[PDB]
Amino acid sequence: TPRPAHVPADRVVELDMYNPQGIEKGYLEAWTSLQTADLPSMVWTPLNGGHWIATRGELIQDIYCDPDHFSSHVIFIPKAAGEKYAMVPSKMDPPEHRPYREVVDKGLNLRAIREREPAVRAHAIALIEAFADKGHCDFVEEFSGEFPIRVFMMMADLPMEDSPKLRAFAAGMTRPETPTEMADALDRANRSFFDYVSPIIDARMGGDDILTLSINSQVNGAPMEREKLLGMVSLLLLAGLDTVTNFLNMTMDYLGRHPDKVRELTENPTEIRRGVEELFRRFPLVAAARMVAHDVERDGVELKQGEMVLLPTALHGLDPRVNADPWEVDFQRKRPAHSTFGNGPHRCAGLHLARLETTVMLEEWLKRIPTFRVVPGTGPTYHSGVVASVDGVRLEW
Ligand code: HEM
């Protein structure tokens, strides 16, 4: 197989990150296939312009916490997919990353998410009781595709029905359509909503929100640049609307096929909050990438500057080398080491909102629907990429 000289032959697998083999059997089961086999902790693929793939769990944590040799200047695959139009501070490296994260953390820290807790759970309550009487529901189109969106719009703009039609912008950045066309499709997918957020940063540059608190924030005694200010507000809409609607689908479907696990939470309701990150360990969906900065040797192979390394976070929480029996959900597990929210300086700034949205879901779904099941003979349709999409969850009770 055509490949550079510094990569061996036993470390080569044909794997498209946007369409892996066995994706129809499960996004989690498809990516864990590289662990059940006998492959080193680091593997390489010729698809999408060629890039490395970290497979072992403890190696993914080591790459995230090493920004000196793994730069964030390129986070998407293929290599030249997210150029010119860059998101902030996802595509930044320290010490440049430090001041711009303080802007996103100004409104997304724990205290700011906690002051909205009674309002967030109000959405879950008003959304569940609209179908709790009918005994069934299309969970993807009556909650998971509504509850997280309505929460973030209440914090930001309230465009009603016109942003959910535009929420496909995030679908264009994590599942575009040859590396040349992937970049050109992501190019227009990035600028079409880069122009949509432009009339929002200027009309809100005075005062009085969650995006306004970020635009009016200063950096070293001066506001942010239009390219670096539009990229920050655009990143908040991306992860805030796409990386959470997909998590609720694959979790409630798992709980619908495990009548004992849901009974464990109904008996002890305090185990929900105390075991929230156990769901994040079992169900990770993000697969971020990094560009190697300097020539480094990790896992017995040398990585040359300019290459891309993929970090599928699904191979950290589901790694049997770190978590004993990674398939079973142990709410009482002591040390559930995961990388669902990433690691290092690029930690999920909205992990507390994710932890709060999932707790107010389970606490209000089980208080009204204790027993529930998935519709028999049905299942989701899994689509991979930078952020796993997945669709098709139907519940009965
Ligand atoms: C709900 C489940 C979510 C998951 C599983 C998730 C996952 C991730 C992951 C894996 C990263 C690391 C990216 C990288 O290393 O390049 C990340 C970064 C980030 N996420 Fe999320 N995300 C979620 C929701 C959110 C929400 C609701 C927000 C709200 C704005 C958000 C804001 C961010 C930001 C700002 C970063 C970049 C942090 C930095 O550059 O230092 N995320 N997320």
**Sequence-separated contacts (24+) of 303-308 with Cβ below 8 Å:** 303/6, 303/52, 303/69, 304/4, 304/6, 306/79, 307/50, 307/51, 307/52, 308/49, 308/50, 308/51, 308/52, 308/74, 308/77, 308/78, 308/79
Please give the C-alpha separations between residue 208 and each of 79, 215, 308, 340, in angstroms, as whole numbers.
Answer: 40, 11, 42, 34
Rounded Cα distance, 41 and 54, in Å = 6
**Sequence-separated contacts (24+) of 201-206 with Cβ below 8 Å:** 201/226, 201/229, 201/230, 201/233
Query: Whose Cα sits closest to atom 1 in ligand 1?
Result: 244
| SS3 state of residue 71 | strand
Which of the listed residues 348, 360, 386, 387 should we mutate to test ligand 1's pocket, taking the one with most ligand atoms within 8 A of CB?
348
Q: Which region holds residue 342: left if phi is over 0, alpha if psi is between -120 and 50, else beta?
A: left
Distance 196 CA to ligand 1 centre (A): 21
Rounded Cα distance, 6 and 8, in Å = 7
Structure obtained using:
X-ray
- Omega prior to 89 cis, within 30 of 0: yes
CA nearest neighbour of 298 among 311, 286, 287, 285: 311
The verdict on the CB of residue 55 being under 6 Å from ligand 1 is: no
Query: Whose Cα sits closest to atom 18 in ligand 1?
Result: 348
The verdict on the CB of residue 353 being under 6 Å from ligand 1 is: yes
Q: Quick one: 203 exposed, middle or buried, by C-beta within 10 A (0-12, 13-18, 19+)? A: exposed
E strand or H helix that includes residue 54: strand 51-54
CB of 71 within 8 A of CB of 290? yes
Rounded Cα distance, 17 and 52, in Å = 11
The residues facing 290 across adjacent strands are: 309
| SS3 state of residue 53 | strand
The verdict on the CB of residue 386 being under 6 Å from ligand 1 is: no
Distance 118 CA to ligand 1 centre (A): 23
Q: Quick one: 379 exposed, middle or buried, by C-beta within 10 A (0-12, 13-18, 19+)? A: middle
Rounded Cα distance, 63 and 307, in Å = 14
The verdict on the CB of residue 104 being under 6 Å from ligand 1 is: yes
**Count of domains in the chain?**
1
Range of the domain at 343: 1-397
In this structure, which amino acid lies at residue 236?
A: L
Q: Looking up tokens 């293929």, which residue turns up?
A: 78
What was the resolution (in A) of this experimentally determined structure?
A: 3.2
Backbone angles phi, psi at 354, to 5 degrees: -65, -40
The verdict on the CB of residue 67 being under 6 Å from ligand 1 is: no
Q: Looking up tokens 């909650």, which residue turns up?
A: 143
Rounded Cα distance, 333 and 347, in Å = 23
Please give the C-alpha separations between residue 303 and each of 7, 8, 42, 295, 307, in angstroms, as whole numbers.
Answer: 8, 12, 10, 6, 7
The verdict on the CB of residue 35 being under 6 Å from ligand 1 is: no
Backbone angles phi, psi at 138, to 5 degrees: -90, 95
Q: Which value, in Å, is the radius of gyration of the alpha carbons in the chain?
A: 21
